[PDB]
Ligand binder design. Structure first.
Ligand code: RRD
Ligand code: CL
Lengths: 296, 305
């Protein structure tokens, strides 16, 4: 029993965090094999980069200074070739995630990890993280068996307190650029397939007060979802919720009628899994994984 | 900016998790130096759980009855002893991944990270608090026994909890790393229930200061309160009494924001009376009590927005 916002164990990522210094700027780097990946803003980026030499970049791994032997740029990420391969390099992949998918963040400062938390890529491509000055280069990831899938690298904070960054190939998530200019997050929406997954998790943990005898059509549900700034529910989302529907005996459109009733009426002083708001940062897979016992 | 329920990086603890098997039972163990610590109920059958005599069960065991697995390697047990509700298995190999550590017993209201494990393999990390009724609201399934709670301050891991059981309401009970339970619980399948739980007042106040630091002040008012009047009101909403120690502990946050503890206590009184009115505080519609005054100072900026 119990339902917490759970992050993946961060050990395999902690062994890759390094500190990168260029002039007066200091941020975090990801050391994988003989390459250190970090935001290019540590330094017209090609014009600034051509003026730099290898020794201008100071890389620190714990108490050891790594020697930079090369440097190149890939989109908004800087790749620093170092003399030493990381002996702690885990099995890994670089993957780009979609809005609604969740991941763990290892927040770092000066190449030292300070905390781990779980979050989701919002529909407006921002993340509601917890970052202070010096956190740039902190990374987001998932684990499949023994393989670490790196999906995010932190680059900046927007005026509303939300965060923007790139995949590990340097492509930003969202219409953002790496520079101090007028940038705002677009109007955000609720991740509908995730709220439904969390309502199934509540039923599994014995919370059924919100269930009703009714069903809805997919079109009627989406007409109500569009009114409450909820992301449209697709047939793919319904198919993905299939195993949870079979486990609890509540058809996806049956659960949509419960959510429609919660959107028009609220909770009435009641809570679901200890929350007074409808929670959208748990995917259908996170619910199955936490209510099964999958290890790494 | 931002405020999340953050756990400590779990790497130093992952390198200590092992699987302990005794007969048909399998649970998690903590391998530190040449000792593996695990719940003593690993020597029980489900039948023995009603009225177990642990000393009588333990004397019938020899070293080779305990199977310890660290990854793909089998550790050899060379000794065993009991300390309260924890079993200590002496192994022939010291853990090369042993971090700098201490065993600390925490008080209710204190927070810690939990590394949930099954078969000696870590599956997730989350942050939680020791409730006033000595239980934890964790997320644990069958096989999670022996999972541990900890804090990492500087580079030293402070082990404070080891998971032992789930109560009928779905909450969890366990011990410190010396085997002393938190709460009036026993490692018996006896009809025991968690006492009525209460809200950790000093933590809610800390979180209201964190909201002011991140630029939110809609809940403040022009009133103050006496400590006694605050406690007379808060106890009616099942809030833990606020002591002078709690007020002293909130001193640095009061100096940083310019809001006296008894003025913050007056906004809390009003929040309990009126509710939120469709508003949120740090993205929450409920008053959050699982962040200590120390956690707020650690996570939030030193400069108030
Ligand atoms: O009934 C039982 C079975 N069970 C075994 C074990 C125990 O509580 N294990 C577990 C730990 N953490 C989470 C769990 C989630 C689901 C199932 C077992 C869990 C135990 C240990 C001790 Cl020290 C005392 C009593 C018991 C005991 O009763 N417990 C719960 C109440 O609903 C299932
Ligand atoms: Cl304490």
């Amino acid at each position: 029993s119990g339902f917490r916002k759970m992050a993946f164990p961060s050990g395999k990522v902690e062994g890759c965090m390094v500190q990168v210094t260029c002039g007066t700027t200091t941020l975090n780097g990801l050391w994988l094999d003989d390459v250190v990946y970090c935001p290019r803003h540590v330094i017209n980026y090609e014009d600034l980069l051509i003026r730099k030499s290898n020794h201008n970049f100071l890389v620190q791994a714990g108490n050891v200074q790594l020697r930079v032997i090369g440097h190149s740029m890939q989109n908004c990420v800087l790749k620093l070739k170092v003399d030493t391969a990381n002996p702690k390099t885990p099995k890994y992949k670089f993957v780009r995630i979609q809005p609604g998918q969740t991941f763990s963040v290892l927040a770092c400062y000066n190449g030292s990890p300070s905390g781990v938390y779980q979050c989701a890529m919002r529909p407006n491509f921002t993340i509601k993280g917890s970052f202070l000055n010096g956190s740039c280069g902190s990374v987001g990831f998932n684990i499949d068996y023994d393989c670490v899938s790196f999906c995010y690298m932190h680059h900046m904070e927007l005026p509303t307190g939300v965060h923007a960054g790139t995949d590990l190939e340097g492509n930003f998530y969202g219409p953002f650029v790496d520079r101090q200019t007028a940038q705002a997050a677009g109007t955000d929406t609720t991740i509908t397939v995730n709220v439904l997954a969390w309502l199934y998790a509540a039923v599994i943990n014995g919370d059924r007060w919100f269930l009703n005898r009714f069903t809805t059509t997919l079109n009627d549900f989406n007409l109500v979802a569009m009114k409450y700034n909820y992301e449209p529910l697709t047939q793919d989302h319904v198919d993905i919720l299939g195993p949870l529907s079979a486990q609890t005996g509540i058809a996806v459109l049956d659960m949509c009628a419960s959510l429609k009733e919660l959107l028009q009426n609220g909770m009435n002083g009641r809570t679901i899994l200890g929350s007074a708001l409808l929670e959208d940062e748990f995917t259908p897979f996170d619910v199955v994984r936490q209510c099964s016992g999958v290890t790494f």
